[PDB]
Amino acid sequence: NDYIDNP
């Protein structure tokens, strides 16, 4: 699953 690193 795709986890993005920092908002």
Backbone as JSON Lines, residues from 0, in Angstrom:
{"i":0,"aa":"N","n":[0.88,-1.22,0.0],"ca":[0.0,0.0,0.0],"c":[0.89,1.24,0.0]}
{"i":1,"aa":"D","n":[0.41,2.31,-0.63],"ca":[1.19,3.54,-0.74],"c":[1.15,4.53,0.44]}
{"i":2,"aa":"Y","n":[2.27,4.63,1.14],"ca":[2.41,5.57,2.21],"c":[3.3,6.75,1.79]}
{"i":3,"aa":"I","n":[2.77,7.96,1.83],"ca":[3.56,9.12,1.48],"c":[4.34,9.58,2.71]}
{"i":4,"aa":"D","n":[5.49,10.22,2.55],"ca":[6.28,10.5,3.74],"c":[6.0,11.7,4.61]}
{"i":5,"aa":"N","n":[5.83,12.89,4.05],"ca":[5.56,14.02,4.93],"c":[4.66,15.13,4.38]}
{"i":6,"aa":"P","n":[3.44,15.25,4.94],"ca":[2.44,16.25,4.56],"c":[2.98,17.7,4.52]}
